Amino acid sequence: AKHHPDLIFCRKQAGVAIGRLCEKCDGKCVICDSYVRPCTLVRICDECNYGSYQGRCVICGGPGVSDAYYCKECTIQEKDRDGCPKIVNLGSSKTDLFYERKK
Amino acid sequence: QLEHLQSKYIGTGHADTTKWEWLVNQHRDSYCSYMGHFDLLNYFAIAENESKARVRFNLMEKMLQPCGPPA
Amino acid sequence: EYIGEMGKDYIYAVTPLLEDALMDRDLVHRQTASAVVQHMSLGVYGFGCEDSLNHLLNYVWPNVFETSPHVIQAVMGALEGLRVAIGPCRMLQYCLQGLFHPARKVRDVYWKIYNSIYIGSQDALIAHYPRIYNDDKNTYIRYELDYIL
Amino acid sequence: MFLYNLTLQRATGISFAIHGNFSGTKQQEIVVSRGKILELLRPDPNTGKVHTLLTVEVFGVIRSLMAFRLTGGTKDYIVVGSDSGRIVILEYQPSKNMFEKIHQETFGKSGCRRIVPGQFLAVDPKGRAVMISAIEKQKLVYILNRDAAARLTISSPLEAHKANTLVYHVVGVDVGFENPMFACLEMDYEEADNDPTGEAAANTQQTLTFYELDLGLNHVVRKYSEPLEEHGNFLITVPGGSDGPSGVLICSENYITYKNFGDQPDIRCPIPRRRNDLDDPERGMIFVCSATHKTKSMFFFLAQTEQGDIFKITLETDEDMVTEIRLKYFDTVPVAAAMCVLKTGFLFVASEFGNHYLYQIAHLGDDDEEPEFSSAMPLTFFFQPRPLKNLVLVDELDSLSPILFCQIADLANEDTPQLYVACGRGPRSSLRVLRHGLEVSEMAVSELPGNPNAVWTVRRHIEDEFDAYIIVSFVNATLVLSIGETVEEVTDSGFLGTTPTLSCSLLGDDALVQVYPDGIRHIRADKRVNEWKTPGKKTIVKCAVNQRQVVIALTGGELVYFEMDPSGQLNEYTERKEMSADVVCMSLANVPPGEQRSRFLAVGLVDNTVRIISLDPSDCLQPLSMQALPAQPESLCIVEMFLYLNIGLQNGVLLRTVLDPVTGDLSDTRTGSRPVKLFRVRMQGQEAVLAMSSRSWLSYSYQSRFHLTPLSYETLEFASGFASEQCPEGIVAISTNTLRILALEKLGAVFNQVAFPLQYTPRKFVIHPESNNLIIIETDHNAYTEATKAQRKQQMAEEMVEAAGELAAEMAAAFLNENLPESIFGAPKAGNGQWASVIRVMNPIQGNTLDLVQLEQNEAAFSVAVCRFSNTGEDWYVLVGVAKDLILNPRSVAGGFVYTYKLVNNGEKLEFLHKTPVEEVPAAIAPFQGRVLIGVGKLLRVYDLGKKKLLRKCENKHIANYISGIQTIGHRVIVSDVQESFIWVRYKRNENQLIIFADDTYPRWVTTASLLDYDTVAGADKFGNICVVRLPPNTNDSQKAEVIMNYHVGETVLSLQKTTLIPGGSESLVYTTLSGGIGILVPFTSHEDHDFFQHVEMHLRSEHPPLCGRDHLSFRSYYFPVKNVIDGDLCEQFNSMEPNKQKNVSEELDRTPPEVSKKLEDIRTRYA
RNA sequence: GUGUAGUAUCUG
RNA sequence: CAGAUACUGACACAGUCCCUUU
Ligand SMILES: [Zn+2]
Ligand SMILES: [Zn+2]
Ligand SMILES: [Zn+2]
């Protein structure tokens, strides 16, 4: 999520595990959040795939249903050679409306 | 912050970078790239009557401290 | 962004609109035109249409010394998208002009731009480095590139 | 203006070599990798020669190459680490005759960066893991395994990063069924960047670190790290586990050391030194390569020094502890980059500069005469080199790797220009001559007075292995002969050859039928003659001979049908046909063993229409298809093996058509308005055709590719197949009113070479415009001239005599009268700033020097030219630029001199006239307008001839850097800088002033340039880029020049020339690479073809990824973005895929695969 | 209609 | 330090609780 300047990416390593995407975000770029021309698959480090974190969506974290992908700009710019893009942060715009709507 | 990616990669400078550590990295990168291309080493081995192994050994040895000692 | 490869024919029409878009107007105009230029340069990469991209590059550079996060976030993206369609050789000349500036706010921005250029296409900068003469006691000249057959 | 990049010759520069069972059977193949080309080749164990099986391209440089096999397997895999930034595992498929992608893992960015794995690659000998490491901080380890699917698997990579560490070499330690262990040579430099005094730069040792792979906890940790005494360069693995000890064989400078982890001593045996070395006694001795011949009975090792001397390392041990190392000098070979000890006593040597050899081992070196060294001897060993006495040469592979200069010109009495390349380096340099065609070999020459026109050679029996029958036919007379290595006149043939012979058929297994104008006479091996006389005044025209049937035609189109029977009796049909024209050209296909006979017969007529008549008697004498031709055909022939047909026309053109009763694909090409005949020949056990014209032509079908290549020989009119014991495969052909024998040995290729030996490395040469001679010059660093070497040897062999011992020193007498050669034993490299130059004049026709001029010490020749001045008449002066005390790395000189010769007596003499001293080294000499332009470093000057020296007329100082090139045209001259691309300066003769007006923006490391017509300079680059710079039309002859072309060949280019290559061709842009490749940059003609080619290239960019895996557009944009260039190798690669993928690629453009292939070959066959 | 970051201008 | 008026980021909207255990 490039809109929130609070989220922190992982950038540990690649692997043989393929990321998954949920219904809320099916054809969105992992970094660009675009909608055009998926090009390459997404790999995640073993630290991001273990037990309760297995088969979860990369951006939000819901039950994944379809494979993730990279847009053509990310392939031309070689932005996929960084590691895994899994978000390791809870966020501030998604963990506050909970307590705001509790009342 | 967008400085996370720029920090984990060596050779990245900042606002308090002195010329010496810029030039030593500039020379080290060239030395590393010399051994990559085969024709870039053929040219060096033909320019001076030496062998490829000797040129590679000299290039590896010169990487310990190029551009002299610091200040 | 949508047309992609087909933008090499309508490249001339938008230029005398970005030209007066990159003026001293509100920040929104220059913020949006930076993304426009980024997509425009990324869509035509590899087809040899850098003649107009070089002219367009002369307007993005003045709008780098800003403070709002959005405008700089767009301008750095535009510069990164232009550096792959034009080449690191042209960007290095612009960046090296004020690297060792005697101020600090300009030096920080120039070093950030240099780091952005340095991370990508690392090996492509070997042949584009300038020549620096020797000081009192140091070796600053790559003598291995002066060999003549 | 768009350009199309084709290729003519592929690079032959070997960098890596591996061996193993890459096929699956019990035969070992060699996988040799070029600079960016993956190649496979295997040697024949029965004859020793080596063939080629695959030359696939990977589109990217290769930095490592390793081979491994799984446990309990029988197939070898290939692991490739390259600039792609990934790791690739390949597999050879004999059925598909092509590689197979298996795995692909990404672990970083792309480019030869510092922290990027891919440089050093090591594999576990047992085949359980693989380690790929960078030059610094980026060690990575994978875990290979096999699963229930019998397929290779790759696990997640394991990081082993370590900051501030330089890696020299990585090798895999051999352990027997334990955890994998790897070794590396680290050297920290953190403390060297914090002490301004510089004392930390020295006294810094490097350690031998062993890395432990925990196979139960899935992590890698380092255990042992001990400092060393002196620096090393590479390591050799030792077979351990259950067969021999485990350890390393670190090869430091002037020493070899064995070290093992745990508790074990060390062994240091000094390297043997050559006896009475003529070089400076302060140069270290190091190894360059190694080998391994591990065998269950006994194992040894190999090594090679700087001078190219093979040793034999044997270890001594009792149970685990190694006691001593026993060296022994094996042989002497040219310096190589890799060796492969092959089974069955074969050794493969791949030289780094020159041809590639292949030796066989007769003796293993047991109970020799020379002693063996050991570490037990206290305290500078010596040995005496000698001829081989242990190996023999059985094969040599040509390779024009180090090409420094090229020039295409026509000097002989023909129309096809030849290539005069100046390749080679060192004492084994040569200047080869390249011409299109094949190599011609002859065995014997015989004189046959008269006027023969044809000859036949058919086996007596179908089971015969030696050809016997020869029927030499004159215009009317005949003369039967035979081949038995004693070819003479034969009489007992009993053929009654008193009539002209038109054919010699093979009707049955051994039945032969002769043709005479009065009928048909059968001639069986047994006394069974079936003669059929034909009364009348009209004779026979031709006859369609075949292995099972005969078809004949008479004057006016009177068909006669013949068919044989198993009993052995002839037959004839009772139907006769009528024709609308006359019989001119015939053809007949072969019969496969799987069918009773052929399918159809081809008949040609005057109306230029081919007629197809079936052989079935039910519908015999009935045409099926009709097709006219633009011109009258002359001869016809059919080739087999998917089958195609060849159509020969009256003029010099040959047409190729696929085998089909109805008309189909047409392939038109030029064969010179003369009749062309096509016969059946044999090659390597395969069928081929042979066309004869003003020049001989040979066409062969091999792996779905057709090459129409001529023969480098004079005019020929007839040829025939040949096979015997003396020659492996030859050709029986006749000559102009005489007899000859032709032989072919080399595999099908182009650019035949004839080598002229030289003495040093040629720098530049020029061609005399009147006597077509050469002014070749030479210059090499670290060398001694013919006089200094002799005087140094004489002085050295005098002080050692008076060594206070026995007055009885007679070895000087035996030493001064025997000098070893230099082309096999290397050269005595001495000094650090020594030079030697030689000026040579050579006849391009045959190799024989005309004059030799030897310069004195520390004089390097850098430029030569031939000029003619104005104040003097026809006086061809020769100017040579000579430096003085040139040191390379700390560049500093003390001036130079320019020589001047006269070149009298039409090109075989040279007298010294005078020399002019200069304060800087000259590099560019260019004559123009009866004067000479001299570029002395930064300064630029113009000189004029005087009486004792040269006069300086004009001076200009505006070049930013060192001048390394000058070319002149009209009033505009171009100065090639070393960092700036180009500088345009104009010379005016009114006030004698040089002014610069136009320059370039992007700096370039230009090495050569060539103006195309008037304003575009086709330059080059030191890194591989090729660019074209054009000046704007509105320039006032501050004003930059635009760039219209950019590309990245990937190899250094030092030759550019625009000259037609074939008669009737066009203007090309032939260049030459630094590895041995020749390419062209031909442009497009029409506009509807450029779009098709661009679409094909764009579609293949995604439908056919590179073998290693890398963006082709990014690869071609390595330094500068591509511009107005379309790759042609990728387009030509379309011919090699699967049929379904071919159809899928073709269907978008609404074309058939034959339609795409035909024009792809047509564009190539037109410009070259 | 509401909430989650960021930015510009006048006045006190 | 505060108030007011405009603006940007294809920002998100009972989001739902998925080792918290006897
Ligand atoms: Zn989601
Ligand atoms: Zn993206
Ligand atoms: Zn992760």
From the number of C-beta atoms within 10 Å of its C-beta (0-12, 13-18, 19+), residue C8 rates as middle
At A61, list the tokens: 């974290």
Number of residues in chain C: 149
DSSP D270: P
At D142, list the tokens: 């994978």
CA distances to D114, D840, D905 from D412, in Å: 53, 21, 21
Q: What resolution does the deposited structure have, in angstroms? A: 3.5
- Whether the CA torsion D365, D367, D370, D374 is positive or negative: it is positive
SS (H, E, C) D341-390: EECCCEEEEEECCCCEEEEEECCCCCCCCCCCCCCCCCCCCEECCCCCCC
CA distances to D186, D790, D791, D819, D847 from D786, in Å: 45, 6, 9, 13, 21
DSSP A48: G
Place of tokens 């996929």: A80
CA distances to D80, D151, D152, D153, D941 from D148, in Å: 25, 8, 10, 11, 78
How far is the C-alpha of C94 from the C-alpha of C114, rounded, in Å? 10
At D415, list the tokens: 């129309």
At D576, list the tokens: 């006769």
Phi (first) and psi of residue B62, to 5 degrees:
-70, -10
Per the domain annotation, does A95 fall within a domain?
no
8 Å CB contact between D505 and D550: yes
CA distances to C22, C26, C28, C126 from C58, in Å: 10, 19, 19, 25
Nearest protein residue, CA measured to C1' of E3:
A97
CA distances to B51, D3, D429, D872, D946 from D336, in Å: 10, 38, 16, 52, 50
How far is the C-alpha of D842 from the C-alpha of D771, rounded, in Å? 11
Phi (first) and psi of residue D928, to 5 degrees:
-160, 140
8 Å CB contact between D304 and D347: no
- Edge-first strand listing for the sheet containing D633-639: D633-639, D644-649, D653-658, D667-670
Nearest alpha-carbon partner for D646 in D579, D585, D702, D583: D585
How far is the C-alpha of D486 from the C-alpha of D271, rounded, in Å? 57
8 Å CB contact between B69 and C139: no
- DSSP structure string for C69-122: HHHHHHHHHHHHHHHHHH-HHHHHHHHGGGTT-SSSHHHHHHHHHHHHHHHSSS
For D202, the 3-state DSSP assignment is coil
Sequence-ordered list of residues with C-beta below 8 angstroms from that of D453, at least 6 positions apart, any chain: D473, D474, D475, D717, D718
For residue B31, give the amino acid letter.
Y
Q: Is A39 annotated as a binding residue?
A: no
How far is the C-alpha of D825 from the C-alpha of D276, rounded, in Å? 14
User: What value, to the nearest 5°, has the Cα angle with vertex D481 and ends D477 and D483?
Assistant: 155
8 Å CB contact between C89 and D1025: no
Domain hosting A82: range is: 8-88
Interface with chain A: mutation pick from C1, C40, C45, C116, highest number of A CBs within 10 Å: C1
Nearest alpha-carbon partner for D108 in A58, C129, B25, C122: C122
Interface of C with A in 52-111 (CB under 8 A): 69, 80-81, 84
Residue C132 contacts B, CB cutoff 8 Å: yes
8 Å CB contact between D1113 and C46: yes
From the number of C-beta atoms within 10 Å of its C-beta (0-12, 13-18, 19+), residue D704 rates as exposed
At D412, list the tokens: 């002989």
The CA radius of gyration of chain A, in Å to the nearest whole number, is 14
8 Å CB contact between B36 and B56: no
How many other C-beta atoms are found inside a 10 Å radius of the C-beta of residue D971? Answer: 12
Q: Please, which residues bridge with residue D305 across strands?
A: D287
At D629, list the tokens: 């031709």
How far is the C-alpha of D1062 from the C-alpha of D1074, rounded, in Å? 24
For D998, the 3-state DSSP assignment is strand
How remote is the CA of residue A83 from the centroid of ligand 1, in Å? Answer: 19
| Structure-determination technique | cryo-EM
Contact D761/B29, CB-based, under 8 Å? Answer: no
Q: Please, which residues bridge with residue D1040 across strands?
A: D999
Chain C residue with CA closest to D1005: the answer is C127
Chain B residue with CA closest to D165: the answer is B64
Per the domain annotation, does A102 fall within a domain?
no
Nearest alpha-carbon partner for D1062 in D672, D668, D765: D672
Per the domain annotation, does A27 fall within a domain?
yes
Nearest alpha-carbon partner for D1071 in D1063, D1084, D1082, D1083: D1082
Per the domain annotation, does A63 fall within a domain?
yes
Per the domain annotation, does A98 fall within a domain?
no
At D78, list the tokens: 């290939």
* Pairing verdict, β D152-154 and D158-159: unpaired
Sequence-ordered list of residues with C-beta below 8 angstroms from that of D237, at least 6 positions apart, any chain: D125, D171, D172, D173, D174, D248, D249, D292
Instruction: List chain B residues with CB under 8 Å of D61.
Output: 36-38
For residue D119, give the amino acid letter.
Q
Sequence-ordered list of residues with C-beta below 8 angstroms from that of D494, at least 6 positions apart, any chain: none
In angstroms, how far is F17 C1' from B7 CA?
37
Instruction: List chain B residues with CB under 8 Å of C148.
Output: 47
User: How many folded domains does chain A comprise?
Assistant: 1
From the number of C-beta atoms within 10 Å of its C-beta (0-12, 13-18, 19+), residue D765 rates as buried
For D1132, the 3-state DSSP assignment is helix
* Alpha helix stretches (DSSP H) within D238-287: none
Q: Please, which residues bridge with residue D1028 across strands?
A: D1018, D1045
Q: Is A25 annotated as a binding residue?
A: yes
At D451, list the tokens: 């006027």
8 Å CB contact between D238 and D249: yes
Phi (first) and psi of residue C106, to 5 degrees:
-70, -40
Q: How many helices (H) and strands (E) in chain B?
A: 4, 0
- DSSP structure string for D613-637: EES-GGG-S-B----B-SS-EEEEE
Instruction: Give me the long-range contacts of B28-31 (CB less than 8 A, separation at least 24).
Output: B28/B63, B28/B66, B28/D114, B29/C122, B29/C125, B29/C126, B29/D113, B29/D114, B30/C126, B30/C129, B30/C142, B30/C144, B31/B59, B31/B62, B31/B63, B31/B66
Per the domain annotation, does A93 fall within a domain?
no
Nearest alpha-carbon partner for D780 in B50, C24, C74: B50
- D417 CB-side CA count, 13 A: 18
Beta strand residue intervals within D736-860, DSSP E: 738-743, 752-754, 777-781, 835-842, 849-854
For residue D501, give the amino acid letter.
T
8 Å CB contact between D942 and D933: yes
Helix axes B38-47, B19-34, angle to 10 degrees: 90
Per-position b or e across D862-876, b if 16+ CB within 10 A of its CB: bbbbbbebeeeeeeb
For D426, the 3-state DSSP assignment is helix
How many other C-beta atoms are found inside a 10 Å radius of the C-beta of residue D769? Answer: 10
Chain D residue with CA closest to C126: the answer is D1119
Cα maximum dimension of chain A: 48
Q: Is the CB of C25 under 7 A from strand F?
A: no
How many other C-beta atoms are found inside a 10 Å radius of the C-beta of residue A26? Answer: 13
Q: How many helices (H) and strands (E) in chain D?
A: 7, 87
Nearest alpha-carbon partner for D946 in D1000, D1001, D900: D900
Sequence-ordered list of residues with C-beta below 8 angstroms from that of D949, at least 6 positions apart, any chain: D914, D916
How far is the C-alpha of D1046 from the C-alpha of D1025, rounded, in Å? 7
Q: If interface means Cβ-Cβ distance under 8 Å, which residues of chain D face chain C? A: 109, 111-114, 404, 763, 862, 888-891, 923, 961-962, 964, 978-979, 1002-1005, 1007, 1021-1023, 1046, 1054, 1113, 1117-1124
Nearest alpha-carbon partner for D556 in D535, D538, D532, D534: D538
- Whether the CA torsion D561, D564, D565, D567 is positive or negative: it is positive
The CA radius of gyration of chain C, in Å to the nearest whole number, is 18
For B4, the 3-state DSSP assignment is helix
- DSSP structure string for C33-68: HHHHHHHHHHHTTTSS-HHHHHHHHHHHGGGGS---
Place of tokens 């090792």: D301
8 Å CB contact between D839 and D861: yes
8 Å CB contact between D510 and D525: yes
How many other C-beta atoms are found inside a 10 Å radius of the C-beta of residue D404? Answer: 20
Nearest alpha-carbon partner for D128 in D110, D168, D155, D108: D155
Q: If interface means Cβ-Cβ distance under 8 Å, which residues of chain C face chain D? A: 45-46, 48, 50, 85-87, 89, 120-124, 126-128, 131, 143-149
Q: Is the CB of A94 under 7 A from strand F?
A: yes
- DSSP structure string for D596-618: SS-SEEEEEETTSBEEEEES-GG
